Amino acid sequence: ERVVINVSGLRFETQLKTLNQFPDTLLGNPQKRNRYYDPLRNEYFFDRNRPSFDAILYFYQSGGRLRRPVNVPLDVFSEEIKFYELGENAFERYREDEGF
Amino acid sequence: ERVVINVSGLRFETQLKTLNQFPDTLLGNPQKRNRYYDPLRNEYFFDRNRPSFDAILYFYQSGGRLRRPVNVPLDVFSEEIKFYELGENAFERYREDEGF
Amino acid sequence: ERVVINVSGLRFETQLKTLNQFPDTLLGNPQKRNRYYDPLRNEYFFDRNRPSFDAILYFYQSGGRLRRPVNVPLDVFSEEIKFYELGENAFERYREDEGF
Amino acid sequence: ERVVINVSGLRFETQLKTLNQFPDTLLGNPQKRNRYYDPLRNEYFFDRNRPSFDAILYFYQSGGRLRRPVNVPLDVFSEEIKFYELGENAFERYREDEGF
């Protein structure tokens, strides 16, 4: 099943299975992701930072690799990983990787 | 209400409420933004630099965080923040952040 | 008149007047740009490098500012400015700006 | 013949001839690329990293120039060139270019 995630007009596509492998995240939990469903467009809409999302989707595609894009600052990216609820395990890895 | 902002073919989407929170800017003022409405496509069209716009929309989404993308030079970005009329408060913060 | 330039699937939009201000370039010369018209899609198609094009269109929008994106290497960008026939005046400025 | 390659929602377009010049790669071999055909959308779908793909398509357009985008880390890019089966000749050049 193909899913369309619209981040501020930038459309990402993936399979439901890709998101569902991390069920304790916003996009992996139907109950949380469905709060963001747009019934008019059959998409999930986020009125959020666009350049961070490459990395949020790749976290799922890669089975857990969390990497901040260089064109996106630390604090911006930190707020997005928290919003998408990637988990304390992933936040720990990220924190070691950047210093703090 | 969903808004489509077409910057040189790159389409951004946001909510009207997101833009309207900064009413003393081009995109937050209906009177100014409507000069750029494209009645054929039901979008606002800007024939302008594309890579700067991520940051112009995120200024609204973040409630005021103004950040220059690294792939975009200082002078290019400076001209865009002036064009979008982000305000002297925001221009001051930006100026401290980059030197000048 | 709105123009759609499809660079390898990345669609850029501008006005004809924007391109026509530099008539001695590929995109500013109807005779040269029309070799790339796609009658099925009513677009100009280039099966070329995508990240360089932001900067090729901005050269026209800015009235002549030629800048290489940082995510695009020198030799890649040099080949694109030559292909788009931006002119020896612009190529000189670029050459000073990068060394050689 | 125009081909649409959908990488996680980012659509790339090229000509079949462009891909077919490197027949010993995934995208240059009909038998391998067709495993990824999406009959509902008449596209080839890859649920993969988006920022690396500029460079994978440009490898074909340029007749062999393989370059890692700067916004994409070494290990991420290395996994994509292996997946797309660009060849040991190209992997050797890449390895010299980055160290290892």
- Return the domain boundaries, chain C: 1-100
Distance CA C16, CA C13 (A): 10
Distance CA B52, CA C60 (A): 16
Distance CA C13, CA B95 (A): 31
Task: List chains adjacent to chain B, taking adjacency as at least 3 C-beta pairs closer than 8 Å.
Answer: A, C
Q: What is the DSSP letter of D65?
A: -
Structure tokens at A76: 């911006």
The answer as to CATH 3.30.710.10 being correct for domain C1-100 is yes
Task: List chains adjacent to chain D, taking adjacency as at least 3 C-beta pairs closer than 8 Å.
Answer: A, C
Q: How far is C27 from chain D (nearest CA, A)?
A: 20
Structure tokens at A95: 């924190």
Residue D76 to residue A58, Cβ atoms within 8 A: yes
Distance CA A93, CA B88 (A): 39
| CA nearest to B9, candidates B48, B66, B54, B59 | B48
Three-point CA angle C55, B51, B25, nearest 5°: 125
Resolution for this experimental structure (Å): 1.5
Q: Technique behind this structure? A: X-ray
| CA nearest to D24, candidates D13, D16, D32 | D32
In this complex, the residue of A12, A13, A67 whose CB is nearest that of residue D73 is A67
Evaluate whether D54 touches C51 at the Cβ level (below 8 Å).
Answer: yes
Interface subset of D 19-48, CB within 8 angstroms of C: none
| CA nearest to D71, candidates A14, A3, A58, C75 | A58
D63 touches chain A (CB under 8 A): no
D49 touches chain A (CB under 8 A): yes
D5 touches chain C (CB under 8 A): yes
Q: How far is B53 from chain A (nearest CA, A)?
A: 10
Distance CA B95, CA B73 (A): 14
In DSSP terms, B38 is beta-bridged to: B43
Q: What are the φ and ψ backbone dihedral angles of D3, each rounded to 5 degrees?
A: -115, 135
C62 Cβ contact partners less than 8 Å away, ≥ 6 residues apart: B49, B76
